[PDB]
Amino acid sequence: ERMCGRMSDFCREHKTTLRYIIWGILIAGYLALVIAACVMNFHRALPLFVITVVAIFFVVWDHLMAKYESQIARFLSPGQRLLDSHWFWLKWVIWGCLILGVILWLVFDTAKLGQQQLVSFGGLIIYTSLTFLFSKHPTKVYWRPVFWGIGLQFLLGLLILRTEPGFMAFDWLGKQVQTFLGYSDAGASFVFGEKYTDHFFAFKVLPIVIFFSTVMSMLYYLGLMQWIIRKVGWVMLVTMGTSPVESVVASGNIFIGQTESPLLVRPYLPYVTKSELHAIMTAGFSTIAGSVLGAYISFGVSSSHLLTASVMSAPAALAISKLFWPETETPKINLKNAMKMESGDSRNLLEAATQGASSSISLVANIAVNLIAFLALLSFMNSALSWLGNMFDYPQLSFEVICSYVFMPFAFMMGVDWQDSFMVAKLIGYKTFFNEFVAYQQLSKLISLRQVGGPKFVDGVQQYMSMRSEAISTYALCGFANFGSLGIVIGGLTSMAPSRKRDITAGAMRALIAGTIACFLTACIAGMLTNTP
Amino acid sequence: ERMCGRMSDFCREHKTTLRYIIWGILIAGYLALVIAACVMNFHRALPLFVITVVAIFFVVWDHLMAKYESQIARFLSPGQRLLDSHWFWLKWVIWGCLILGVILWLVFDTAKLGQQQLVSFGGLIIYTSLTFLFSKHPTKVYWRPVFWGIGLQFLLGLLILRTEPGFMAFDWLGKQVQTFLGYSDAGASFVFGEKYTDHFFAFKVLPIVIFFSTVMSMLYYLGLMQWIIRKVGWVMLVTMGTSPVESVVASGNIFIGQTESPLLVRPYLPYVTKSELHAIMTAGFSTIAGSVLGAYISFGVSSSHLLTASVMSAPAALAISKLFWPETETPKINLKNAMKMESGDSRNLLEAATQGASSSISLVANIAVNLIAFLALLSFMNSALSWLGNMFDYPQLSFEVICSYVFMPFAFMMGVDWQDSFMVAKLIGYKTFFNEFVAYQQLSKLISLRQVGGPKFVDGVQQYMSMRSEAISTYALCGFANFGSLGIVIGGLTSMAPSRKRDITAGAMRALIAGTIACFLTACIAGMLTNTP
Amino acid sequence: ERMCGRMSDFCREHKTTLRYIIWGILIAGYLALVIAACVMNFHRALPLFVITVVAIFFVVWDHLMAKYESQIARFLSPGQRLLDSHWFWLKWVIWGCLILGVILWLVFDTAKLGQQQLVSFGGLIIYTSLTFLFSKHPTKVYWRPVFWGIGLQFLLGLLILRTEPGFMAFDWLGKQVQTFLGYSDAGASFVFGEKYTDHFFAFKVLPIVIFFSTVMSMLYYLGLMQWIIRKVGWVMLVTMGTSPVESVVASGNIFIGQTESPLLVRPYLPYVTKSELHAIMTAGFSTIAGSVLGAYISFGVSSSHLLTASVMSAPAALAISKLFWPETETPKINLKNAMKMESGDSRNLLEAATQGASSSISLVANIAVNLIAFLALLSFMNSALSWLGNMFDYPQLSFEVICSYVFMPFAFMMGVDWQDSFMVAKLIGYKTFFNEFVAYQQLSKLISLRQVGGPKFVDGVQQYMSMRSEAISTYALCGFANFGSLGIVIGGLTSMAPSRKRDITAGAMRALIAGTIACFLTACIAGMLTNTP
């Protein structure tokens, strides 16, 4: 007993020192492994070396910003005062310079590119103007978020699309995500057998959502997801001027789904304002999750365009939300509380994986059931429309024919040419009424037909559409905003915050419209920047 | 801002006028479409014209009954007083005339038809007498519901079975339902692949319940289901004399399942009397849903007989419930409250479809699991009975052999001939212990063997049975009254009304017996009316 | 009415007499059937005769112990006092005799058997010593439970393994269980079609858990499971000295799963001590359910070893729990309350079957989802470890290679030879991180390779391992203690007893370690007793 007591006292004495010592030993071992790999053959060890270097750089940066925050603020203070003193006369100068730059760039670039590239800018203007017209509180609007959101979208798109180094990186990332989620498909062979490919959607696609949920929960436990969310949220906060909680939600939605994204700020959902809840729902509707990215890239959809659309949507979502539901009340929640995200309560990583996996049981079931019902309804609708049309000697009437004409103006304003606007409109209808998975499937079919080659028109029916129309379609359809999905968002948000049940329902419908408009804005910028093939 | 205010004021001024104007414009457009279709080719446009005419007639009738209700009641009042004044002497005359008519019809018709047609009437009498013997409160019974229920059953059966125009309509309706639910099977190919037919029950049959639930929820939101329920309930109320809530539940169960039917009067379930709750459960047990109708017609079961059985069961259910659990306490719930059914809280049709689809997730899982367990138990029972029989040199002993002898008297009383009574008894055993899906499958096999032709007896075993026995079996087995299903009804009703948890359990067992007896009564009437082939 | 009243009075008079009369008539009929079967052909009727004789013997024994309990206690009292008076000097004599017997048996038997048979005893000592070292309260420990647990394990193993009559019985029981659960596989063909074998795990294996749950619920309703649990618990109680509730839980876990076993003492879970809750969790982790037994026997795993391991684990679980978390507080719960187990609330057997079947819906879904996620994670881990290894010119690095070296000492201490210890270590790693189903699959592959014959080493890789190593592996891996499974146990126990939510989490981790150590102890005894092939 005495020896055990002495050992316990020794352990108590060295607790912090011992933990630091063991962590340092582990880090030194990792560095030794890296250096050995570099010694033997640097070329093979290049990825590991790059990862280590970037990790060290980020850790050093974080530590310095933490410790030296006061000194940096002291250095920055005089410039802020000098700017404030001269801001009155300088604001007009800055605004004029920005307008002149916009005019010069638009004229030269787009005028040389063609007419269709300019109709996209016209559509950008039209969408923003219409959203201003039908705003909930038109009189009280803050324009800084809107302008900064559009500007950030333009800059990100310009870098990624007009620079070869920028274009290559997102392709690489898309391939990595595809492989990582393809690890899931192999793992699901065990449960459903090697004949799981017989039932593709049930036994191949849905298990990818289970694997993605597990991985996301593990990363949440470790504390990485939070880091990236904080960085992007700080960028948006320091430029757009939005509130903290909505920024954190928006940055998270780049990779997290709509159902799970509010869990980041769950503890403060009871106290959020109506505008912030509308922003949350709009961000949820305007962006897709990482799980679907691999499947959509597999269909044939471009990795670069999908990732760029997902990144660009969140600033667009916040801007459109502010222009479609401006805030009229003070925000209670603080920056420190919002940025802080409680880690998973699971004791160990494997418990976090188990809990993340179990949660996915509801989602997959709901998805499968909704798909069954809605596709059966589509079949009934087509048969009845054909029956009605036969009376008027037009047996070809269908959902697609109606939706081609109904949604054509939106496609034309986005910069799609007149002939292909109808084809894009059919896909938009599929995305709105049914989910975007079906729409991406149809788009993949059209892309494959273009790649195979052959007659553009077999008969007076067009078979495939141009590449730029496909890019604009990729941007436009990159969302979770479908009417069938309105119920699940409401139910989840009500579950997380029962007190706010009424506010969630009141603003739910406007959020879907805002998300669609945000996707359209991303598409318009893409059309402005992509050249005519 | 001023222009927006002026527009808002103008919108406020014209609200009702504007809504009426737009609705009128839409109706005028529909009428123009109909008239154009009739102009071009009337023969093709015949269905649309008929639908429009009947809809207009019903709307006019409803409006007139609403506005002119007081005048019609004033016109009707004197006749009621005149009847009441002379009722004392006239009641004996009416009863004697009815008895004489019954005697004359029975003698002529059934005596010419044969002995078996008359044993069915004998069985009708026997079942009613036995239910009177073992009633919960034999002394206090109201005979008007029982007599009116039997009479309405007889009239509906006579019209549908003995009139060619009546017979054709239900066949048409069954075909329509089959097609509408076959739209579901096509829609479920997407989720489970084109190889979904490999697993028929899991991937073909169960999805039909999901599609049916979605459609029923949408129609509930629109307000049609309620209209039909109200009409049939009013008929039963004005003739049988039952209470409002039980009548509404009974009329709804013609097409709605047992689990979902109480949701029509959910708000008042806490306050219903014990007799009314017994009536609710009995109606649930004695009738089948619309989802199963398409499958059962597909197996080979007659559409006309299935629909006629479903329609006839509800009056039989109410009559048998009143004779098996007569009411001893005053009914609190009013006619207006009961007839009124709250529409779905879903904001839009698509939300209603989503909510209806999500609810079906539990039901399909419970059904599949119960089927697995109970069929495995049947396999074990057969193997052990064969093992026991081998000791006594009878290795053929099985569940079917025991159930053929046990249930034979019920089949004989229903009017089935002696030879086929055992075959019907096997099916009744399958229906009672396991669900009626298996029983309908066996019945379909026997029907197919009859249709193919061949030896009636391959050896001293009969292979197929006569057509009339099949009709009586179709009527007898048309129910959801199985012992495995007792749990789900109790759980659902307890969920809807937690306060009444004890009353639900106390009367649950008697309800199953009452439902079986009601199915037997429908079968007896069918046997009385169907001629010997 | 008067006749009904007279009949009711007559029924009231004879209630108990009538029930006894009918039960006696049924029993007499059963005896008549048995005697007829014996008359015709005794040899065929032998199983029925044996079952009847044993049932009669047990009923007579139970009745006599009930009625004559006081007389038996009176007879036993003097001997207890005489033993207590002389216990002071006799305890040393008894302990010395036991030690001398242990020494003599160990020397003769194991020394003749070989070195490996003795390293197993050494490992037994090592595991017990280590558990004593790292105990929660090392100072306060009761050694009687530990010593009695080890002794009972040794006696059961000796009987079952070293006696031919003992060995044959468990093989017979395993075959019976396999057949009874194979009844399930046939019954599940209906729901998933005859092509259900295409997806083996989803459509063949998981349905066996549904059938097992249904059967267990029915037996719980009837009152058999409880009888066996009480008998085994009384044995453990009268020898080990443990508390009642933990003994009841431990005896139940021989055949009941971890998720469902606490339901036996659910009503008193709010009041159990921390030590008893740790014992419950340890018993849950150290034993497998009956559902998996048929599958594992089908793979090729020996029936006798599996059943012996399951039986031996529970005393080991209790002993290791007492040595790893000794009790420091008084136990409130009484023997009578704990032994009594409330029967199912279901009114009839079929309701119990339905309720048992419905409960399984959650378990199968959780199992399937966890398997998908964890196997996908294994695939990712292997690919990344291979990628890292390629840098150091060792592309074969994998999870298996690391786990072979990490877990080798445990396998060596269990008595496995040096060459096969690595192969066993791989299986132990599979069991710990992933569930034991995968590990048993790999073990079945190795057994099949041994049985086919061929090169022991195709190259410098060993292909199959010796029979004794397979037996030790069968004992070692016979558990539900996997890290993925930690979450489900916590969630279920928290659901049953919400008040104790914190105590459940605090002691959850130690329980898994204790369960693994208990499995290792069973393996060590098996290695000590099994001879070298």
Ligand SMILES: CC(C)C(=O)OC[C@H]1O[C@@H](n2ccc(NO)nc2=O)[C@H](O)[C@@H]1O
């Ligand atoms: C299986 C996938 C590819 C699919 O078919 O998606 C259809 C609908 O499922 C919703 N969804 C999906 C994933 C998610 N997190 O991973 N959250 C969601 O809400 C979302 O509305 C979408 O449209």
Ligand SMILES: CC(C)C(=O)OC[C@H]1O[C@@H](n2ccc(NO)nc2=O)[C@H](O)[C@@H]1O
């Ligand atoms: C899939 C269908 C054809 C089936 O196999 O039915 C078996 C059992 O499922 C119950 N059931 C079914 C549908 C329903 N609403 O659509 N409510 C119910 O309660 C009912 O007891 C029946 O016997």
Ligand SMILES: CC(C)C(=O)OC[C@H]1O[C@@H](n2ccc(NO)nc2=O)[C@H](O)[C@@H]1O
């Ligand atoms: C389908 C079976 C063979 C399987 O693959 O099992 C994997 C994991 O499922 C857990 N499990 C299983 C059954 C049960 N009662 O029958 N209770 C449980 O907890 C347990 O942890 C095991 O490791």
